[PDB]
């Protein structure tokens, strides 16, 4: 009964700002972080930044310079993310989530259902295949691989067209509250495999891998799943 839900469409001109929010409820506010993760054709995944509320403590991508804003109102239980001066290339769907730990280095469980905005060195993670076509009940295994040691740092989604990503793996083999016992997790250091065994269905859809052993969060371009 966790529940982020975020503010409509925004329609913007490039130079001028917006703010997002993200109303969470269902559980105690203080004893989790918000973090927000924008996505687009192009870009894929990006990580924006995040707040540990309890803490007041934010952090934000060095891409940005400065010109994201996240706060919180425990008062409301309710986040923002203000982003100045936007140029074409911010839009995107925006998307916040919470991050059940107490740093914003982390993954996230809950995804909000997303903002879309419209205008007008780091560790890398590259996932294999791209694509992969599979038959109901087949054994699928994907690849993602960090361009450095991540320990077991690593976390599996999955995202079905145009709905919020749902977390399936974290700290490499750790699975998560609610996924299908049928996924599991594999790899330590800078290889890692998500396993399906016996695909279903309902497994057709679009997986990513994301590591939260430093800053900046970094996600994989994705695998998409497809039948035949």
């Known amino acids: 009964q966790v529940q982020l839900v975020q503010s409509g469409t925004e329609v913007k001109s490039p130079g001028s700002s917006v703010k997002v929010s993200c109303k969470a409820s269902g559980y105690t506010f203080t004893s989790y972080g918000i973090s927000w993760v924008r996505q687009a054709p192009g870009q894929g995944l990006e990580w924006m930044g995040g707040i540990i509320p309890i803490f007041g403590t934010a952090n934000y991508a060095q891409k940005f310079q400065g010109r994201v804003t996240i706060t919180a109102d425990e008062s409301t239980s309710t986040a923002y993310m203000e982003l100045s001066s936007l140029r074409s290339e911010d839009t995107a769907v925006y998307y916040c989530?919470?991050?059940?730990?107490?740093?914003?280095?982390?993954?996230?469980?809950?995804w909000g259902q997303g903002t879309l905005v419209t205008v007008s060195s780091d560790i890398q993670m590259t996932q294999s295949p791209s694509t992969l076509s599979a038959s109901i009940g087949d054994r699928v295994t994907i690849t993602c691989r960090a361009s450095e040691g991540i320990y077991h740092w690593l976390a599996w989604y999955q995202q079905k067209p145009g709905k919020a990503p749902k977390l399936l793996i974290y700290k490499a083999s750790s699975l998560a509250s609610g996924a299908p016992s049928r996924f599991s997790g594999s790899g330590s250091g800078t290889d890692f495999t998500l396993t399906i065994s016996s695909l279903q269905p309902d497994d057709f859809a679009t997986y990513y891998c994301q590591q939260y052993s430093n800053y900046p969060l970094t996600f994989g371009g994705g695998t998409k799943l497809e039948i035949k």
């Open positions: 989530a919470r991050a059940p730990g107490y740093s914003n280095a982390y993954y996230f469980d809950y």
